[PDB]
Swiss-Prot record, chain C:
Component of the 40S small ribosomal subunit. One of its GO terms (molecular function) is structural constituent of ribosome. The modification Phosphoserine is found at S8. The gene is RPS29. It holds the Pfam family Ribosomal_S14. The keyword Iron does not apply. GO terms for cellular component: cytosolic ribosome; cytosolic small ribosomal subunit; rough endoplasmic reticulum. The modification N6-acetyllysine is found at K47. InterPro entries: Ribosomal_uS14 (IPR001209), Ribosomal_uS14_CS (IPR018271), RIbosomal_uS14_euk_arc (IPR039744), Ribosomal_uS14_sf (IPR043140). This is Small ribosomal subunit protein uS14. Component of the small ribosomal subunit. The ribosome is a large ribonucleoprotein complex responsible for the synthesis of proteins in the cell. GO terms for biological process: cytoplasmic translation. Belongs to the universal ribosomal protein uS14 family. Zn(2+) binds at C20, C23, C38, C41.
Curated annotation (Swiss-Prot), chain D:
It is found in: Cytoplasm; Nucleus, Nucleolus. Monoubiquitinated at Lys-25 and Lys-31 by RNF25 in response to ribosome collisions (ribosome stalling): ubiquitination promotes subsequent activation of RNF14, leading to EEF1A1 ubiquitination and degradation and rescue of stalled ribosomes. Deubiquitination at Lys-31 by USP16 is required for maturation of the 40S ribosomal complex. This is Small ribosomal subunit protein eS31. There is a cross-link at K25, K31 (Glycyl lysine isopeptide (Lys-Gly) (interchain with G-Cter in ubiquitin)). Part of the 40S ribosomal subunit. Part of the small subunit (SSU) processome, composed of more than 70 proteins and the RNA chaperone small nucleolar RNA (snoRNA) U3. A zinc finger (C4-type) spans 39-62. The lineage of its organism: Eukaryota, Metazoa, Chordata, Craniata, Vertebrata. The modification N6-acetyllysine is found at K22, K31. Component of the 40S subunit of the ribosome. Part of the small subunit (SSU) processome, first precursor of the small eukaryotic ribosomal subunit. During the assembly of the SSU processome in the nucleolus, many ribosome biogenesis factors, an RNA chaperone and ribosomal proteins associate with the nascent pre-rRNA and work in concert to generate RNA folding, modifications, rearrangements and cleavage as well as targeted degradation of pre-ribosomal RNA by the RNA exosome.
Amino acid sequence: MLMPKKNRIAIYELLFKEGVMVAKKDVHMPKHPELADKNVPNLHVMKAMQSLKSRGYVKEQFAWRHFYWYLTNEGIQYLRDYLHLPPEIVPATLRR
Amino acid sequence: MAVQISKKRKFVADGIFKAELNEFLTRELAEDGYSGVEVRVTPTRTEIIILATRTQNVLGEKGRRIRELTAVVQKRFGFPEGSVELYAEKVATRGLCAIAQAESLRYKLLGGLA
Amino acid sequence: GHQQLYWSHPRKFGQGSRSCRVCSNRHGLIRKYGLNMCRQCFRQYAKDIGFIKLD
Amino acid sequence: KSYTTPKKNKHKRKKVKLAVLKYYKVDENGKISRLRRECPSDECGAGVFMASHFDRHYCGKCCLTYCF
Amino acid sequence: HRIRITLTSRNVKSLEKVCADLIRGAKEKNLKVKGPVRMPTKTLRITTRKTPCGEGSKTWDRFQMRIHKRLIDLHSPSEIVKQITSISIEPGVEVEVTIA
RNA sequence: CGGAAGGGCACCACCAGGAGUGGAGCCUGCGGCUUAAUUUGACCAACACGGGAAACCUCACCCGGCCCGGACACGGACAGGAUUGACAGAUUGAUAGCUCUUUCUCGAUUCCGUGGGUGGUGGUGCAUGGCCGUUCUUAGUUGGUGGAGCGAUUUGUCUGGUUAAUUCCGAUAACGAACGAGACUCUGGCAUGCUAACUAGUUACGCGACCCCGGUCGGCGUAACUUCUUAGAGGGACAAGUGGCGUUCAGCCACCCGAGAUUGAGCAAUAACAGGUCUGUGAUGCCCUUAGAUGUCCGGGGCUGCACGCGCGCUACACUGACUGGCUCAGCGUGUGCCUACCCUACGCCGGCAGGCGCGGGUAACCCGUUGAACCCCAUUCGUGAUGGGGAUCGGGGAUUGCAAUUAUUCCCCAUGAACGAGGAAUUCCCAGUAAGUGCGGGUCAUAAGCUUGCGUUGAUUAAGUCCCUGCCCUUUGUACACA
Ligand SMILES: [Mg+2]
Ligand SMILES: [Mg+2]
Ligand SMILES: [Mg+2]
Ligand SMILES: [Mg+2]
Ligand SMILES: [Mg+2]
Ligand SMILES: [Mg+2]
Ligand SMILES: [Mg+2]
Ligand SMILES: [Mg+2]
Ligand SMILES: [Mg+2]
Ligand SMILES: [Mg+2]
Ligand SMILES: [Mg+2]
Ligand SMILES: [Mg+2]
Ligand SMILES: [Mg+2]
Ligand SMILES: [Mg+2]
Ligand SMILES: [Mg+2]
Ligand SMILES: [Mg+2]
Ligand SMILES: [Mg+2]
Ligand SMILES: [Zn+2]
Ligand SMILES: [Zn+2]
């Protein structure tokens, strides 16, 4: 994917803050639904997290028409040392 | 509701909500004895009850996976934050649930038992 | 351009505009009450929706 | 299978060596003017360069064709 | 003050349990009531060919969804009926209470 | 299995019949032919079936052109720049920078090879799951222990009577059980008794309009009530009562009482078919394809093509009728959608009509809507003539939906006026609110019912029987049959 790295780091920010992420199986979304702020297509989002899951940092589920992605511990390793983030911060699924 | 949905399509819309909720939890927690759900609604928050066998594993370490799939349910269905809550409970008399016994038979066949 | 070409055809009506709620299937939908799912998967999930065969 | 009418070849991007060099001019001391005309584009003040094409000016980002 | 309650469910016995419970709640908090009026049951009927393929004897399912709706009128203040509707409801019954 | 016997049973069988179909036009589906393609599944239990009413989409088929949506790993080349996008102008269909030429930006996301994945309405339903259909709408099926036989097996599961029924009484080397039938659920029919109702009403009462005290009003408001309306809880019918028939058992016939003295569906066993579905799926084995793609997209075409054959249907062949006025009656339902952009409409104007333009109601017992529906009833005209029957074919114009209608999408107006004179061999569905006539809703739907699923409405002839033909079940018997 010739991905705007802006948008890819933004999707990584969504995955980290809202600790896991859902999307619709729809390459022809005009624009992705979870975020209203940026401009990233659901096609970019889907293939970005397929590139995430192929080397094994996120795990996939598919119900009726929606991809579900769950960020594993190796994924939280890769995501924090990729986003250059110190280990004081944790996802909202880990906050209690 | 300001868009003011009618009652006829309202009951089939939350019926089809409970259907895809049950099928989503079936595709996820089939490894861990997911028996069913019960969805009961109040004003400003909605109690959705997963009813399964291995409650220790549907919670997970510390309760991580329940918070994980509360976030999944809210993000997928467009629920407001903290407006629905997942509670996980134990099957009374585990042997009689044909769902859980079909899944236990399925994992016996997948583990290789004759 | 290809940005103005790739999904340029209108999906405003017809068979391919609507799709199955569970399958991305275009045949045998039931739009009554906004189920928007095919008849096979409807009669699969019908007892879970609430449509019980009284007679 | 087989198809005897020949296929279209891929437009290979023309490999050029240090094409950024041709936008400014160099004197040995501080005398620098610009070979390619600048943009009144709203996104870019004076950063990116236009082109001097086969006859006549054009910018690719804002895509503005300046004609005779 | 003419505050009205509507009860709507796919189920009949749970709905009438909730409506008689609210009548007795209004009676124990001592205010009159125009009774539970029963407006007609809306049927949602679906007839589909039972077969996934095309062949077979041309048979048809007859699926139905019954929806029952009843009304309770109360001349009363607001927090009385708010605390009576905060309690004693079955999951199948949808309650909608409006003020005017 | 029998063109062998004995019993029973079913309008997917017959008799008495009714409406037909087969004959005509048209619609649709299938075969054939044709074609770039006119994709394809299925040939009682295929053929108005795939919810399959395809202009685009669907689309899978055909002609062309784009795109990667080829992850991930390894190894190259690379910021001295790996490589996206690019208006001109040519070419092209397209302003696809698709390719050529001139060159500008993007900045590590990506390209180049090898493994490997992925997508597939590609194949195989004769690798499969699920689901349906069918055997098979009949009454059938099976363990435990005991008896018989060396055994496959058998008895239980039966001589008889009886029933819709392997339903019961009863016999008894069987006893005690399970499924199926029944029971059950919904529906229908009856309550002037219960519960109550400004999202339903009735009756009064008071104002209002009109007619010569009274009458009409679906004109306006309130004091009782719930018969009508809505839907809840109970009830109500059990072969209960009576008279016969029968071992006087199971039960059958008739009659009083009665809203009913058989309402209609749903569910539906054991075993099975190499019945259908890989074209419903992110259910799926394997195979095949995988950048010149069988992936996806866009443009156009085709799915409709006509010497012909068959099937489901609608319109008809008219006087029991057509046409033109008038009068007066329903019940199902549905209605502004996550994406989703397209709802049902009163009412006021414009237009012959299709329709157009405005202000309103309705997320619905509120508004459309008291759903002023058709056949029907009444009064005209027509006159037995392919006729004022029938309305196919076809010319010209006017609207609506669409991004676009040409191979006329749909509707409107005028003109055109064909076959068809009650249909050969053959063949279907049906017995009570049934057949048939009739029109209205849902699905399909942007536009949209010659279909189908429901609904009312007018509403009978005939029958309460049989094993004759087609079949089904049980017993006996015969077999050289066992893919029977
Ligand atoms: Mg008979
Ligand atoms: Mg006959
Ligand atoms: Mg014929
Ligand atoms: Mg004919
Ligand atoms: Mg097409
Ligand atoms: Mg196409
Ligand atoms: Mg597939
Ligand atoms: Mg088969
Ligand atoms: Mg087969
Ligand atoms: Mg090959
Ligand atoms: Mg066709
Ligand atoms: Mg005529
Ligand atoms: Mg069409
Ligand atoms: Mg004539
Ligand atoms: Mg026959
Ligand atoms: Mg059809
Ligand atoms: Mg002999
Ligand atoms: Zn589906
Ligand atoms: Zn510029």
